[PDB]
Design a protein around this ligand. Sequence first.
Ligand SMILES: O=C(O)/C(S)=C/c1c(Cl)ccc(Cl)c1Cl
Ligand SMILES: [Zn+2]
Ligand SMILES: [Zn+2]
Ligand SMILES: [Zn+2]
Length: 231
Amino acid sequence: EYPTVSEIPVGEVRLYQIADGVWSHIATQSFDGAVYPSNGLIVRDGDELLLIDTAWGAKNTAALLAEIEKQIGLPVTRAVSTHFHDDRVGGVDVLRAAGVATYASPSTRRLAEVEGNEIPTHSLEGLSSSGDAVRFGPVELFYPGAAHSTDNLVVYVPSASVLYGGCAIYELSRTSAGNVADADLAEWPTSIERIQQHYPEAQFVIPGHGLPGGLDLLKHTTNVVKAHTNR
Ligand SMILES: O=C(O)/C(S)=C/c1c(Cl)ccc(Cl)c1Cl
Ligand SMILES: [Zn+2]
Ligand SMILES: [Zn+2]
Ligand SMILES: [Zn+2]
């Protein structure tokens, strides 16, 4: 029942309700002749919504906002991008234009800038050291250490025990490393272990791309990362 690529045309965005007040948003993008899914999150915060990550580009992100207004009908007042790649910040200018306050760690902002990507307006403090956590509205933000990228954040929704790993976490069907040009292969397994230590009670784990599962996705990612390491 969780949507896959074949069900989502590029341009279109799906919402999937995970818990009371918790959805993922799912979009697709075609790159080098293949089509990829990508996840983000939506958390209700009173009469407003917190958005985690864009839907990978301006077009998809504009469709995400229309889809949220149509299906949920509460305003997106804030957005956090969990790292500096285009699937996380591509569409930030659309959010900003719609009056959404956009946020990211200083480190994510600097890396976006260097990459020439869109740049969240606000800087998130308290997340500079591995193991650091801060509360941001209805979620906890966690910096596990470098993994898929040096800046990657993970997000936890304590009310629903939902752990959103972003692109630091692989789905189960993904058995080979994705793009790791910006990865810290050496630290990645250690960073995943910090996630496991901090959220042992997580009941749903969302990867940046593909199908959700349970905490097994953490060991799965380490397995893939270590395999790639020994290539
Ligand atoms: O494997 C992943 O989760 C991602 S984010 C791959 C990637 C990278 Cl490394 C750079 C740029 C872009 Cl656009 C993408 Cl999609
Ligand atoms: Zn990435
Ligand atoms: Zn990604
Ligand atoms: Zn596995």
